[PDB]
């Protein structure tokens, strides 16, 4: 129960990972991949936009 969560120490409450005791580890994986992929996509989109409109 919640007050018992307040009794116990950290080891019993979360995990040593980023997003320890909030999100599933597989979801952590998924969203990390999503971040990296779409920011790379953003970058290539930005540069193709810049160069085509620089030609134009």
């Amino acid at each position: 129960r919640p007050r018992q969560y307040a009794t116990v120490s950290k080891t019993h409450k979360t995990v040593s990972r980023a997003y320890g005791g909030s999100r599933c580890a597989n979801c952590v994986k998924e969203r990390i991949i999503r971040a990296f992929l779409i920011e790379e996509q953003k970058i290539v989109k930005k540069v193709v936009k810049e160069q085509t409109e620089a030609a134009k």
Binding site: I33, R34, L37
Partner: peptide
């Protein structure tokens, strides 16, 4: 689409 884009990479 995630799997798709990852394979694309």
């Amino acid at each position: 689409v995630l799997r798709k884009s990852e394979l694309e990479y």
